[PDB]
Symmetry: C3
């Protein structure tokens, strides 16, 4: 069942990557 | 170990949805 | 195996916590 977890962690890696950008986006605008 | 990882990963996935929303809110005010 | 996943989670947890702070920061400055 580690594969389901690995895929979720991969999904978490990517969401976190996108949130960092949109936050840094907000940081330049504020 | 294995169960705790899966739970934490699920804990993380929901925190991501909440952050995704908090970021969206902030965008409407930048 | 599991260790790779716990490492990754520890990372995402750090990221999540810092995004939380950054979100808390941006909130205070619209
Ligand atoms: Na929200
Ligand atoms: Na917000």
């Amino acid at each position: 069942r580690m594969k389901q977890l690995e895929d979720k962690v991969e999904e978490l890696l990517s969401k976190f990557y996108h949130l960092e950008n949109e936050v840094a986006r907000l940081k330049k605008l504020v």
